[PDB]
Amino acid sequence: AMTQYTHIRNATGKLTIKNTTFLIDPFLAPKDTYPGFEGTFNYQQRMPMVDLPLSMDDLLSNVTAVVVTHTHLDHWDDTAINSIPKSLPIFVQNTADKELITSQGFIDVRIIFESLEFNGITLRKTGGSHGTVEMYANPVLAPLAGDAMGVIFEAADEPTVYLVGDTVWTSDVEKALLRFDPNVIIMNTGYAQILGFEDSIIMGTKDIGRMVVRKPEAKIIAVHMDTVNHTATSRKDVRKFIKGNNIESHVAVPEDGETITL
Amino acid sequence: AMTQYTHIRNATGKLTIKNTTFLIDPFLAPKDTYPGFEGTFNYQQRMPMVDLPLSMDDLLSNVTAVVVTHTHLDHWDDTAINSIPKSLPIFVQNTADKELITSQGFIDVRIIFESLEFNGITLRKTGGSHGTVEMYANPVLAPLAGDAMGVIFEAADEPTVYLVGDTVWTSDVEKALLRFDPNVIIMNTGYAQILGFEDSIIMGTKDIGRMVVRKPEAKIIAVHMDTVNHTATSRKDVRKFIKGNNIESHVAVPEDGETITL
Numbered sequence: 001a002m003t004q005y006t007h008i009r010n011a012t013g014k015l016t017i018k019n020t021t022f023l024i025d026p027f028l029a030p031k032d033t034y035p036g037f038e039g040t041f042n043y044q045q046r047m048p049m050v051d052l053p054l055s056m057d058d059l060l061s062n063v064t065a066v067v068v069t070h071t072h073l074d075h076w077d078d079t080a081i082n083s084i085p086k087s088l089p090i091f092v093q094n095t096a097d098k099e100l101i102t103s104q105g106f107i108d109v110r111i112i113f114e115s116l117e118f119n120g121i122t123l124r125k126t127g128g129s130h131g132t133v134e135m136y137a138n139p140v141l142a143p144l145a146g147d148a149m150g151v152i153f154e155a156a157d158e159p160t161v162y163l164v165g166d167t168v169w170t171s172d173v174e175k176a177l178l179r180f181d182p183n184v185i186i187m188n189t190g191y192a193q194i195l196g197f198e199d200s201i202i203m204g205t206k207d208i209g210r211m212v213v214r215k216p217e218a219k220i221i222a223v224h225m226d227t228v229n230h231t232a233t234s235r236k237d238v239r240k241f242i243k244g245n246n247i248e249s250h251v252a253v254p255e256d257g258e259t260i261t262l
Numbered sequence: 263a264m265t266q267y268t269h270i271r272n273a274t275g276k277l278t279i280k281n282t283t284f285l286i287d288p289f290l291a292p293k294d295t296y297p298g299f300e301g302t303f304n305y306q307q308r309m310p311m312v313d314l315p316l317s318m319d320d321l322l323s324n325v326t327a328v329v330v331t332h333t334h335l336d337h338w339d340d341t342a343i344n345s346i347p348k349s350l351p352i353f354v355q356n357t358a359d360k361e362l363i364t365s366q367g368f369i370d371v372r373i374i375f376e377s378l379e380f381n382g383i384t385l386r387k388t389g390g391s392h393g394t395v396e397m398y399a400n401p402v403l404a405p406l407a408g409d410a411m412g413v414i415f416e417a418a419d420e421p422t423v424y425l426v427g428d429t430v431w432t433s434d435v436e437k438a439l440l441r442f443d444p445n446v447i448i449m450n451t452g453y454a455q456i457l458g459f460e461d462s463i464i465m466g467t468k469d470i471g472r473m474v475v476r477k478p479e480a481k482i483i484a485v486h487m488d489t490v491n492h493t494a495t496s497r498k499d500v501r502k503f504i505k506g507n508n509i510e511s512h513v514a515v516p517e518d519g520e521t522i523t524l
C-alpha cells in the first residue's frame with residue numbers, strides 16, 4: 001500500500017516508506033536547460049532531454065526529506081536548490097556536500113557518516129566508485145567523478161531498499177548486498193560514457209544480469225536513463241536485454257512518473 | 263623526535279610525525295602463539311613465525327596513540343589488548359570496531375568517519391577492499407574479509423604518509439593517491455592467499471611496480487611479510503622483484519625493528 005517508489009526522471013524519484021517520503025537526487029531543470037556534458041558520449045545533445053512528468057507542485061507535495069547521493073548536476077541542480085523548501089532535512093554523503101548545500105540556504109543538512117535514523121527509518125551509507133580503476137588513475141577524469149554514495153533504507157516490516165547510486169560494480173556493492181540483503185534494488189543503469197574510454201562511470205545491462213543472479217528474490221528497478229546526454233544505454237536497450245534473458249519478472253524499467261508498489 | 267617509520271613485525275609499526283608517535287596495527291604475540299589461519303595458504307604453519315624485534319618498552323614507551331585499521335588477529339591481538347595502556351587514544355574505522363575495543367577496556371576510542379585531528383596531525387580515512395570482487399561475492403569468504411581502512415597522515419611541514427592498509431588495488435587507492443599526493447607510502451605486500459582462490463586479499467609485487475609507476479617520487483615502504491602463515495610473497499620475493507625492475511631506490515623493505523628516516 002503506502003510503501004512505494006515513484007520514478008521522476010533520470011535518478012530523481014520519490015521513495016515512500018511508511019509516512020515518510022524521500023525525494024532522491026533531484027535534478028529538476030526544464031528540458032534542454034543545459035548543453036551535454038563536455039567530453040562525454042553524445043555531448044552535442046542538450047539535457048535533460050525530456051521535461052518532468054509532473055508539475056512542480058505535485059512533485060514537491062508530500063516530500064518529508066531529501067536524499068542527495070552526490071552533487072553532480074544530474075542529481076542536484078539549481079532548479080532543485082530554488083524549489084525545495086529550505087527547511088526540509090537533506091541527507092548527504094560527506095562534509096563537502098553538507099558545506100555546499102548549507103551555503104545554498106538549506107538549514108537542516110545531515111551527513112550520513114555510517115547510519116542515521118529518521119522517523120523510524122534507518123539510512124545506511126554504502127560505498128561506490130563512480131568509474132573504473134583506470135578512470136580514477138586519470139588525473140583529468142578522476143576529480144570529475146568524485147565520491148558518490150548509495151543508501152540502504154530499513155524500517156520495521158518494510159522491504160529493505162538499496163539505492164545503489166552512481167557506482168560501477170565493486171566490492172562495496174557486494175558488501176551492501178550480503179550485509180543488508182535488500183528486497184528492492186534501485187540501480188542506475190544508463191551506462192554513462194566518456195569519450196576515449198571503453199567502460200562506464202555507472203552501471204548497465206551487465207550489472208542488471210549480475211544483480212538478478214546475486215539476488216534472485218529482489219525487485220530490481222532500473223533508472224538513470226533517457227535523460228542526460230551521455231547515458232549510452234536506454235530503456236529500450238534494457239528492455240531488450242531483460243526480455244532476451246528471461247528476467248523481466250525480476251527487473252522493472254519504470255517510465256518517468258510511474259509508481260511501483262514495494 | 264624526528265619524523266620516521268620504525269617497522270616492528272608484519273603490519274605493526276611505529277610512525278613518528280610532528281613529535282607524535284602512532285603505534286600501527288599491533289599484533290604482538292610471541293612466536294607460534296597461534297595456529298595458521300584456517301582455510302588459507304600454508305595453513306599448517308603457526309604464527310607469528312618470528313618473535314618481536316624489540317622489548318615491549320622500546321615498543322610502547324614513546325607511543326602517543328594507536329591506529330587500528332581493522333581487528334583481524336594479525337592487526338590486533340590479545341597480547342596488544344593486555345599490554346597497551348588502556349588510556350591510549352585508539353583510532354578505529356567504524357562503530358563495530360569501537361564497540362569491540364571499548365569492550366576490551368580501552369576508554370578513549372575514536373572513529374575516523376572522515377578525518378580526525380590529533381596533536382596537530384590530520385588522520386584521513388581511506389577506502390579499501392580486503393579481497394577481489396569475486397571474493398566478496400562468496401558468502402563464506404566475504405564476512406571473514408570484512409572492512410579495513412587505510413589512513414593518510416598529514417601535518418604542516420611534514421611528509422604526507424599513506425598507510426594503504428589491507429586492500430587490493432581499487433579506485434579507493436587511486437582516489438587517495440591523487441587527492442592527497444602522499445610522499446611516503448606504506449604498503450601491505452605479503453600477498454596473503456586463501457585456499458581455492460587465485461588472487462590475494464592484500465597487495466603483492468604487481469602493486470609495488472604499479473605504485474612506483476604512479477608515484478615515482480614517493481618513498482615506498484613494503485611490509486606485512488614473513489610473519490603470518492598465508493602471505494605467499496616474502497621479503498626475498500620483493501627484493502628480487504625490485505632489483506630485477508631497477509626500482510630499489512623507490513622501495514624499502516625494512517627488517518623487523520628497522521627505522522627509516524622520512
Ligand SMILES: [Zn+2]
Nearest residue numbers: 072130148166
Ligand atoms: Zn554522478
Ligand SMILES: [Zn+2]
Nearest residue numbers: 011072074166
Ligand atoms: Zn549520474
Ligand SMILES: [Zn+2]
Nearest residue numbers: 334392410428
Ligand atoms: Zn586483514
Ligand SMILES: [Zn+2]
Nearest residue numbers: 273334336428
Ligand atoms: Zn593483514
